[PDB]
Amino acid sequence: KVFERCELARTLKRLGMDGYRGISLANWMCLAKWESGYNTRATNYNAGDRSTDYGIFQINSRYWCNDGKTPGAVNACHLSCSALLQDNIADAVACAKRVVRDGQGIRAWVAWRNRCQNRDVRQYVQGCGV
């Protein structure tokens, strides 16, 4: 599923993402926008290291989920990477929360540093009722 901006914003707020480990909702919106275009079925194979990025937050298979084909992988979220391709983002949110609980925070995603950090991210939640 491809979420519309405000629909996703409201979904994230209900899932407890606003201010989770100091991360405002607009930052999470910014991250989802640049990672997958708010698409829960997006996947990116990294030919270079044999890992794959899954879902709306493009969570990597080397560290967070199991896809069985990534060498030296850990499954820190204790989930099949399939779980990150569902229309219901609950699993992906619980995994994203796990990612940030690591002494990197939102900076864990280089896309966030490139496109969101130090920028005016208010546009992502404007008019959404969140």
Catalytic one of 53, 67, 91, 102: 53
Is residue 34 classed exposed, middle or buried when 0-12, 13-18 and 19+ CB atoms within 10 A define those classes? middle
Q: How far apart are CA 84 and CA 101, in angstroms?
A: 18
- Name every residue whose Cβ is closer than 8 Å to that of residue 41 and which is 6 or more positions away in sequence: 1, 55, 85
Instruction: Specify the residue for token string 């990116």.
Output: 44
3-class SS of residue 109: coil
Q: How far apart are CA 33 and CA 29, in angstroms?
A: 6
CA angle 80, 23, 102 (to 5 degrees): 50
Question: Residue 47 CB: number of other CB atoms within 10 A?
Answer: 6
Range of the domain at 55: 1-130
Q: How far apart are CA 31 and CA 34, in angstroms?
A: 6
Question: Residue 79 CB: number of other CB atoms within 10 A?
Answer: 19
Indicate which CATH number applies to the domain containing 23.
1.10.530.10
Instruction: Specify the residue for token string 């899954």.
Output: 54
Structural resolution in Å: 1.8
Question: Residue 97 CB: number of other CB atoms within 10 A?
Answer: 16
Q: How far apart are CA 32 and CA 40, in angstroms?
A: 10
67 catalytic per annotation? no
Catalytic one of 7, 18, 35, 120: 35
Domains: count for the chain: 1
53 catalytic per annotation? yes
E strand spans, 8-127 = 43-46, 51-54, 59-60
